[PDB]
Every structure is written in structure tokens, then in C-alpha cells.
Amino acid sequence: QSVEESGGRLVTPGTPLTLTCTVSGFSLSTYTMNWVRQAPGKGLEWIGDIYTDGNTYYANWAKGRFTISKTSTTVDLKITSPTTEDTATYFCARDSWDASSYYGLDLWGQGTLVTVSSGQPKGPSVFPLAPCSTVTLGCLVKGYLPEPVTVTWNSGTLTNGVRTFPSVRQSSGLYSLSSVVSVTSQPVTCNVAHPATNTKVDKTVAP
Amino acid sequence: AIKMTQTPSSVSAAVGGTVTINCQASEDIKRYLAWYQQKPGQPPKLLIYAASKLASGVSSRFKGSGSGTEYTLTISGVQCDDAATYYCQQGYTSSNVNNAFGGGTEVVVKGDPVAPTVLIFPPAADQVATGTVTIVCVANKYFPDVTVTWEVDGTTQTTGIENSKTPQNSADCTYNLSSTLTLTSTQYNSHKEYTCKVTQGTTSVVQSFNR
Structure with missing residues (x-):
């Protein structure tokens, strides 16, 4: 059985956004479904649920700000009027109960990222990091929105000694991160992909 | 409630x-x-x-x-x-x-404790040309926590600094850290020696370069 979320994207404040959770291998006449979000770096926040019989409940803060509904194989979460406080990964998760023993949220999706901003999506700028024998080279990737980017070295063939650091939101509201690789000695190239703007950039780092 | x-x-x-x-x-x-x-x-x-x-x-x-x-x-x-x-x-x-x-x-x-391996990277020419530079310093594979001090010609820098630390490594409990110092290109050209100092307990490790 499995759960999978979709629909997260960068959206301007006030623009209604619907997320979808598609379920496989179990019935929603047996399991209750829950939406839970988590802002970058923060704790889990339960938004609401929809029981097998169709009753929907929302956290007190969420009432009037979200609507949950379902078919036989999907659950939707509509965010009525997004604000920048709504930026988070949104998870769908199923739970159930027996006689007295609550069974917990045992199955979760990988989550879908909602980014709420007045800014346009923007691809990364990539700058080479070099010293000034084996050597550590790197790439600093700056100025992108929304998250994430992926960074690989030589198309994934250099994996040993790679350290990529968590991204940091800048005061501009854009993101940056860095990646470094330890190599011996021929060209060493960082490949930075930003699917949100349909872009990839390769930078060959010169010792 | x-x-x-x-x-x-x-x-x-x-x-x-x-x-x-x-x-x-x-x-x-x-x-x-x-x-x-x-x-x-x-x-x-x-x-x-x-x-x-x-x-x-x-x-x-x-x-x-x-x-x-x-x-x-x-x-x-x-x-x-x-x-x-x-x-x-x-x-x-x-x-x-x-x-x-x-x-x-x-x-x-x-x-098990591990002392950090520290590296500093000066901004590439293509950075300087944008008007803003970011100097990067990394402390790799360490435990327990470190403090980073940035110095510019010997003066402790207190602004323009951002630190990003990984979660603990699941196999060996260590962290990696990147610390960046961001300045204008003019501010950057206004000075010569740039230093990242990483302290663990009372033991310090220093990396520097001259612009």
C-alpha cells in the first residue's frame, strides 16, 4: 500500500492551490486520511483529516483556511488563500483505530513542497570554489527559488568525499547552498539542476 | 482545546x-x-x-x-x-x-570525538564581477560542536556571516559545517587577509588567504 502527494509548486499569496494525495492498496472506507505540514527546519503541524464516513476536521488555526475532500482513491487539500506562512512540505498520512488502541500514522507520502512568494522562480548562479596532491574543490550555488536544486559531481560518478550542505534562505528570499568534493590528481565538474525552472548548469572547476 | x-x-x-x-x-x-x-x-x-x-x-x-x-x-x-x-x-x-x-x-x-578538517575558498573572479562576494569556509567531519570566527586583517567580523550545519552522520555522529562571509566587491577589495578560525573546546584551527 502506498500514498503519494502532488501539486506543490511556487504560488503567489492569495492564489488558491489544490494538493492531491493518491492512495493505492487500501480503502478510504477503512482508513482515515490526514494532512500534515512541516515548514523548513520546524516541527510537524497537523492540518486536518477526513474520516472513513466523510466527516472532516481541521485544527483550530486551519478552520476556514483549508478544505479537505476525497474520492475513492484520492484526497485533496485546498489552500483557500495562501500566505508566506504556508510555505512548507505537505504530507498525506493514513491512520486507523481498533477497540481502544489507536494505531498511529503508519503510512506517509514523501510530501509535496509548497512555496508561497510574490517573487518569480529563478534559476541558480553557480560559482567555482578552489584553493588559494589531492584537493577539495566545490561549487557555491546562489540565488534560486523555489527549492530544491540537485548537485552532482561528474554526473554522479564522483561520490566519495562529496559533502553537500543544507541550503540557506537569504534575506532576499532566495536560496543558496554549497557542495565540496575531495579528488586526487581529469576535469571536475559540478552539475546543478533546478527542475522548477527547467534548467541545468554544469560548471567545470579549475584547480 | x-x-x-x-x-x-x-x-x-x-x-x-x-x-x-x-x-x-x-x-x-x-x-x-x-x-x-x-x-x-x-x-x-x-x-x-x-x-x-x-x-x-x-x-x-x-x-x-x-x-x-x-x-x-x-x-x-x-x-x-x-x-x-x-x-x-x-x-x-x-x-x-x-x-x-x-x-x-x-x-x-x-x-567518538573528531577534530574538524577546515578549508577556505576565496571568491572566484566571476563572483567579484557581480558586485557581491561570498567567501566560504568549511569544517568537515567533526564532533562535538565548533564555533567559527571570521577575521579580516585581524578584525573580528560580526556581520555578513551565515552558518549551515548538516544533521549528525548516522554511522559516526559527526557534523559538516559551511560558514560564509558575504561582502560587497568594494568592501572585499578594501582589505587583504581573510581568516576562518574554527574552535572546538579550546583547540583552534585556522585557515587564511591574502586577496
Whole structure:
């Protein structure tokens, strides 16, 4: 059985956004479904649920700000009027109960990222990091929105000694991160992909 | 409204030791309570349901207890692979809920100490040309925590600095850290020697370059 979320994207404040959770291998006449979000770096926040019989409940803060509904194989979460406080990964998760023993949220999706901003999506700028024998080279990737980017070295063939650091939101509201690789000695190239703007950039780092 | 109060916000334990996490409900939730573990990048994983029952495949090193309004998760024989954030969650009601999950508890596991390997990278010419530069300093593979001090011709820098630290490594408990110093190209050209100083305990490691 499995759960999978979709629909997260960068959206301007006030623009209604619907997320979808598609379920496989179990019935929603047996399991209750829950939406839970988590802002970058923060704790889990339960938004609401929809029981097998169709009753929907929302956290007190969420009432009037979200609507949950379902078919036989999907659950939707509509965010009525997004604000920048709504930026988070949104998870769908199923739970159930027996006689007295609550069974917990045992199955979760990988989550879908909602980014709420007045800014346009923007691809990364990539700058080479070099010293000034084996050597550590790197790439600093700056100025992108929304998250994430992926960074690989030589198309994934250099994996040993790679350290990529968590991204940091800048005061501009854009993101940056860095990646470094330890190599011996021929060209060493960082490949930075930003699917949100349909872009990839390769930078060959010169010792 | 139903409120869950989880304490402490952070706890540390030596490898092999024991960690205890408490959860207080604002009313009697009758053991309709679960515990989860979560590591960055992943959804949470159910550990304990019905307050004290182990979820399928979960290790008996995790132990849930309590009743009424007071619950506890204990982790025995703590290992680096346990470094994570832990959450309690009430499944008693969906009505009049302020928060269903506790605030979470970060568990820091103290494994074998390791001194940081430090590197500094001057901004590339293509950075300077944009009007703003970012100098990068990294401290790789270390435990326990370090402090970074930036110095520009010997003057301690107090602004323009951002630090980004990885989660603990699941196998060996270590961190990696990147620290950046961001200045205007003019500000950058206004000076000669740039220094990253990384301190662990009382032992310091210094890397510098001359612009």
C-alpha cells in the first residue's frame, strides 16, 4: 500500500492551490486520511483529516483556511488563500483505530513542497570554489527559488568525499547552498539542476 | 482545546546511554498516543502506537509508557543511527485541536570525538564581477560542536556571516559545517587577509588567504 502527494509548486499569496494525495492498496472506507505540514527546519503541524464516513476536521488555526475532500482513491487539500506562512512540505498520512488502541500514522507520502512568494522562480548562479596532491574543490550555488536544486559531481560518478550542505534562505528570499568534493590528481565538474525552472548548469572547476 | 507539550526540546546522550522524552496532554487522552522518529529529508516513521506498543519491525530499545495526561518515550543503548527528532502525537480526538503533535525533541548522540578538517575558498573572479562576494569556509567531519570566527586583517567580523550545519552522520555522529562571509566587491577589495578560525573546546584551527 502506498500514498503519494502532488501539486506543490511556487504560488503567489492569495492564489488558491489544490494538493492531491493518491492512495493505492487500501480503502478510504477503512482508513482515515490526514494532512500534515512541516515548514523548513520546524516541527510537524497537523492540518486536518477526513474520516472513513466523510466527516472532516481541521485544527483550530486551519478552520476556514483549508478544505479537505476525497474520492475513492484520492484526497485533496485546498489552500483557500495562501500566505508566506504556508510555505512548507505537505504530507498525506493514513491512520486507523481498533477497540481502544489507536494505531498511529503508519503510512506517509514523501510530501509535496509548497512555496508561497510574490517573487518569480529563478534559476541558480553557480560559482567555482578552489584553493588559494589531492584537493577539495566545490561549487557555491546562489540565488534560486523555489527549492530544491540537485548537485552532482561528474554526473554522479564522483561520490566519495562529496559533502553537500543544507541550503540557506537569504534575506532576499532566495536560496543558496554549497557542495565540496575531495579528488586526487581529469576535469571536475559540478552539475546543478533546478527542475522548477527547467534548467541545468554544469560548471567545470579549475584547480 | 487539546494541547500536547513535549519536553525537553533537545537532549544529548553518550553512545550506549539512555534518552528520556516526556509528553504532556492538556486532557486525558486515554493512551491514544503515538511516537515518531524523523530525520531530515524523510517523512516521520512510526515507532510506538497505543502509547506502548511497538510498531512492526521497530526495535525494543524504544519504549513507550504512561497514561492519562503524561507519557514518556525512552531510548536505550543509544546509537549514532538514533540521532533524529522525535515527536509525540495524540490520536484521541480530531475536534477542537490546537496542536495534535508535540513540538518535537532533537536527540544528539555523543559518539567518538573528531577534530574538524577546515578549508577556505576565496571568491572566484566571476563572483567579484557581480558586485557581491561570498567567501566560504568549511569544517568537515567533526564532533562535538565548533564555533567559527571570521577575521579580516585581524578584525573580528560580526556581520555578513551565515552558518549551515548538516544533521549528525548516522554511522559516526559527526557534523559538516559551511560558514560564509558575504561582502560587497568594494568592501572585499578594501582589505587583504581573510581568516576562518574554527574552535572546538579550546583547540583552534585556522585557515587564511591574502586577496
